[PDB]
């Protein structure tokens, strides 16, 4: 008997950034720290998916801002 | 500037089970395979959270059943 488990895993990270960092840049920092490929990363803030070529300042992302990220992995 | 990213990660696993396995047992298999502590595991099927001392048969979980799991981790 084989069953399938759709595992949804929640982990909170902190990131050291400049307002001038692009979204692409942030996804690279998340890869460097957590191993999530950036093309599997969907960064979310204030009700939007964020576009790679914009900066954190473009989205008024200020310090202690709380973003979300949804990713798919094959293995942890 | 420190920001916080709430990362939600999705990964699908398959598990080799008997109808007679308890929920507790399944969470142990998921720990053994993925490293998620079983006390951080919330197994979900057909609209319910599953209770540790019940068996997969108790929930009519049949082969190719699709369960969900929600967990918190400190690190991947």
């Amino acid at each position: 008997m084989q069953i399938f488990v759709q595992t949804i895993t929640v982990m909170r990270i902190a990131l050291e950034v400049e307002p001038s960092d692009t979204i692409e840049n942030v996804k690279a920092k998340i890869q460097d720290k957590e191993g999530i490929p950036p093309d599997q990363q969907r960064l979310i803030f204030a009700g939007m998916q964020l576009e790679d070529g914009r900066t954190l300042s473009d989205y008024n992302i200020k310090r202690d801002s709380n973003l979300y990220l949804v990713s798919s992995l094959r293995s942890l | 500037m420190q920001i916080f990213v709430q990362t939600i990660t999705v990964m699908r696993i398959a598990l080799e089970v008997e109808p007679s396995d308890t929920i507790e047992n399944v969470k142990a298999k998921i720990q053994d395979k993925e490293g998620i502590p079983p006390d951080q595991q919330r197994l979900i099927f057909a609209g319910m959270q599953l209770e540790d001392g019940r068996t997969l048969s108790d929930y009519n979980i049949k082969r190719d059943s699709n369960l969900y799991l929600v967990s918190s981790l400190r690190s991947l």
Binding site: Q6, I8, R42, I44, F45, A46, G47, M48, Q49, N66, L67, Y68, L69, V70, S72 | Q6, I8, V10, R12
Partner: peptide
């Protein structure tokens, strides 16, 4: 996992407000 990803994105968009 596209259909679960779209759902979770939609949920994370909600949570972000």
């Amino acid at each position: 996992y596209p259909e679960d990803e779209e759902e979770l994105i939609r949920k994370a968009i909600e949570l972000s407000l």
